[PDB]
């Protein structure tokens, strides 16, 4: 049994392996997620595919349940084993307490799976960050994020990955009340932000919405061409 402290304190009060793992989050592809009042919208940017190869095995927007979607950044090897451990707990919750899993419950499971994991012996911390987006009972759309140290933290709009603080500065100057008026109006709010990020010229974007009663529904690159047409044409008439 390999018993060894990996993450220890610093001479000034920091944790080296935690603040190193947040940098590895900062070089993954950018994921942007907002929320409305009836429909939520989230979509990763920088698909960056080889464009002659397979694409249904490269997906980074998965489903934990019928009501919980999940996007992430960071390195994908550590990411999908967090998902498979979250898909078991949200199923064992159903064998207990009868309701479907609330979105606040499943984020505490991921954060508590990650905090004790910087505390244990012989383990490097996780190098991912996530966005957990869902609509619970009584129809309340909300989202969260997850730091690699394990601090779950709600939001109204968020953006992680490489080129996040540039987008996160752009989101606060752009998120108004009337931008969450229509469902397709909220989609162009994401599409304007990702186009203000790493390239995202319609071929590297992949959005996915959820209208609080369905599963996750990915639009093919026909509305992503149609939305980027009408968003740039709305910019070409104002300017």
């Amino acid at each position: 049994s390999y018993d060894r402290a990996i993450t220890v304190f610093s001479p000034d009060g920091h944790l080296f392996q935690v603040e190193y793992a947040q940098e590895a989050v900062k070089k993954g592809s950018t994921a942007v997620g907002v929320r409305g009042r009836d429909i939520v919208v989230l979509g990763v940017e920088k698909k960056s595919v080889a464009k002659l190869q397979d694409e249904r095995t490269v997906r980074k927007i998965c489903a934990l349940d019928d009501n919980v979607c999940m996007a992430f950044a960071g390195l994908t090897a550590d990411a999908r084993i967090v998902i498979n451990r979250a898909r078991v707990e949200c199923q064992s919750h159903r064998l207990t307490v009868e309701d479907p899993v609330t979105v606040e419950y499943i984020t505490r499971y991921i954060a508590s799976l990650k905090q004790r994991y910087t505390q244990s012996n012989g383990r490097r911390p996780f190098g991912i960050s996530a966005l957990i987006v869902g609509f619970d009972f009584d129809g309340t759309p909300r989202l969260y994020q997850t730091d690699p140290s394990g601090t779950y933290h709600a939001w109204k709009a968020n953006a992680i990955g490489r080129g996040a603080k540039s987008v996160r500065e752009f989101l606060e100057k752009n998120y108004t009340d009337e931008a969450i008026e229509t469902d397709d109006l909220t989609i162009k709010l994401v599409i304007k932000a990702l186009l203000e990020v790493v390239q995202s010229g319609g071929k590297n974007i992949e959005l996915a919405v959820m209208r609080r009663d369905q599963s996750l529904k990915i639009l093919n690159p026909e509305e992503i061409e149609k939305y980027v047409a009408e968003i740039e044409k709305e910019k070409e008439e104002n300017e």
Binding site: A5, I6, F9, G13, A154, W155, K156, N158, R168
Partner: protein, 228 residues
């Protein structure tokens, strides 16, 4: 170059216990005051972004119906100690059919606070305040990363600790009332925080002998702000 995690200084203290005392100078400041009418207990939130939801974070959390808490330093490993304190009060209620006192909650957590090693991995980087009303009246305790707890009368914990502790020794006396101890603490928080004080940057919670643990919300809180 590399010591263990379990090494004494030549001056004799330790290394990583003393390092964890430095880590709680980065958290948000927190003030609790013991008054014979009851315990008031406040904190700031340190809101970073306008897009952030403000009520999702919290520092005051309750342990039982008659015991509240307040945390500083790191937050993610504070949630482990809170959950051990909640289970400990329920095992005491289960077997003895009574309420565990405020002091004996604290030493049940403080025995856990120094148990890292290389068998069976680092100290906890938090600092806690415990406000409660047991049968000896209202109490106020303060533990450490080192596992040392002591009863205080008015303790200020956070990044602005020694700046507030100087301004808190001059306003406290043994015959305060709870209505003015609340007002006295918000004057201290108004001086030390960065942003202007409103109904969203802070939150309070009081415990009285009569009623149980009560936490203020954004309707009954701003009357004290406008009548500061």
């Amino acid at each position: 170059y590399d010591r263990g995690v379990n090494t004494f200084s030549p001056e004799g203290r330790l290394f990583q216990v003393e390092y964890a005392i430095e880590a709680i100078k980065l958290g948000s400041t927190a003030i609790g005051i013991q008054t014979s009418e009851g315990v008031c207990l406040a904190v700031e939130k340190r809101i970073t972004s306008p897009l952030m939801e403000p009520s999702s974070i919290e520092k005051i959390v309750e342990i039982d119906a008659h015991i509240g808490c307040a945390m500083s330093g790191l937050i993610a490993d504070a949630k482990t100690l809170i959950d051990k304190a909640r289970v400990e009060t329920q095992n005491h209620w289960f077997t003895y059919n009574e309420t565990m006192t405020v002091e004996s909650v604290t030493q049940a957590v403080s025995n856990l606070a120094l148990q890292f090693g290389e068998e069976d991995s680092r100290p906890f980087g938090v600092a806690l305040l415990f406000g409660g009303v047991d049968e000896k009246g209202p109490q106020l305790f303060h533990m450490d990363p080192s596992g040392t707890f002591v009863q205080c009368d008015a303790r200020a914990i956070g990044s602005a600790s020694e700046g507030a502790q100087s301004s808190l020794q001059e306003v406290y006396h043994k015959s305060m009332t709870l209505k003015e101890a609340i007002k006295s603490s918000l004057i201290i928080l108004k001086q030390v925080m960065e942003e202007k004080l409103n109904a969203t940057n802070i939150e309070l919670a009081t415990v009285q002998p009569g009623q149980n643990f009560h936490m203020f919300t954004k309707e009954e809180l701003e009357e004290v702000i406008k009548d500061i």
